[PDB]
Amino acid sequence: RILVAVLISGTGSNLQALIDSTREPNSSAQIDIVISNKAAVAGLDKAERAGIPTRVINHKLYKNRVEFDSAIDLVLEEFSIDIVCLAGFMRILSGPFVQKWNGKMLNIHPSLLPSFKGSNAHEQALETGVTVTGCTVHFVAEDVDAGQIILQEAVPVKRGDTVATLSERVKLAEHKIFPAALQLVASGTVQLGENGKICWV
């Protein structure tokens, strides 16, 4: 069974969906550690109540990106981790850290990439006026524009929607495709070919 780590910054609703799925009898993965860059958030309570240990690593206490990322990597090695999942982690990782984990780190984004990159995707979609939006799960690459896509799900926009109502609807889709993608990669069904392109068995 593959050992996994989940990194967060807030509430932890996606984290909970991942915990519940890896608990199922037929799962190929197991979550052994949860890390947050912010103290006292709700996501930490969720991890402790499921019997998973936690660690808080504050970016404000370091001199730069590389030193912060190195502190995180030390912990991943301590727990012999194989795969990393970014679930609401609001930081940009340095080049070398991304190189070391190439093909072994997944991220969730609230839009149908390549549309609406960056922060506040829902607000962007409403300003633009699309009638269809969605969510994406992808591998992380040295440039936030070429990460290979694994799975996507389209979500409709209703006239009259507010940022709060659209966010709620897209979140329900996120809880579906993130757990499904972790299982595809953990079982070897989906891999990143050495030609830099996605590959299915």
Side-chain angles (χ1 to χ4, degrees):
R1 184 124 71 178
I2 291 63
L3 304 192
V4 180
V6 185
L7 313 195
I8 67 178
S9 295
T11 296
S13 69
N14 268 305
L15 164 60
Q16 188 70 255
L18 290 178
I19 288 171
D20 298 343
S21 76
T22 55
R23 294 296 193 187
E24 295 185 66
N26 211 54
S27 174
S28 296
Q30 176 176 301
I31 298 175
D32 280 10
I33 184 71
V34 167
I35 297 172
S36 175
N37 68 303
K38 285 184 186 302
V41 295
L44 296 162
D45 299 326
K46 292 179 173 62
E48 297 285 8
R49 291 167 186 174
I52 308 166
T54 60
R55 297 287 168 81
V56 173
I57 305 181
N58 186 4
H59 58 287
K60 304 292 186 183
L61 307 176
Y62 298 83
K63 306 186 303 177
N64 63 212
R65 260 193 182 71
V66 176
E67 289 310 87
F68 169 67
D69 288 3
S70 288
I72 293 177
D73 195 66
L74 192 71
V75 174
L76 296 178
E77 286 299 335
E78 185 193 327
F79 289 80
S80 309
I81 297 303
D82 297 302
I83 290 171
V84 178
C85 289
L86 303 185
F89 192 59
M90 311 298 294
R91 300 299 287 172
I92 304 297
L93 303 160
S94 70
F97 182 94
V98 173
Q99 297 181 187
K100 178 175 183 292
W101 293 93
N102 185 233
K104 297 185 284 285
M105 179 161 73
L106 321 195
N107 179 67
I108 181 79
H109 190 77
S111 82
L112 288 180
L113 294 172
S115 285
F116 313 126
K117 306 182 181 64
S119 62
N120 310 304
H122 301 310
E123 292 163 48
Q124 287 180 249
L126 286 172
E127 283 300 317
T128 296
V130 293
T131 65
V132 174
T133 188
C135 57
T136 300
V137 174
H138 64 90
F139 281 112
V140 182
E142 293 195 63
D143 62 347
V144 295
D145 283 64
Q148 294 293 90
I149 296 175
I150 306 176
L151 254 46
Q152 296 182 296
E153 185 174 317
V155 174
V157 174
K158 297 185 173 183
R159 283 174 279 151
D161 260 343
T162 59
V163 179
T165 60
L166 178 63
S167 181
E168 284 167 29
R169 196 178 307 120
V170 174
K171 211 66 172 180
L172 293 178
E174 286 173 45
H175 297 165
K176 290 187 179 66
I177 66 165
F178 210 168
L182 174 56
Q183 175 69 198
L184 288 175
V185 171
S187 68
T189 308
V190 177
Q191 298 170 46
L192 211 197
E194 293 191 2
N195 56 174
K197 312 297 288 302
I198 202 68
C199 176
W200 287 64
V201 177

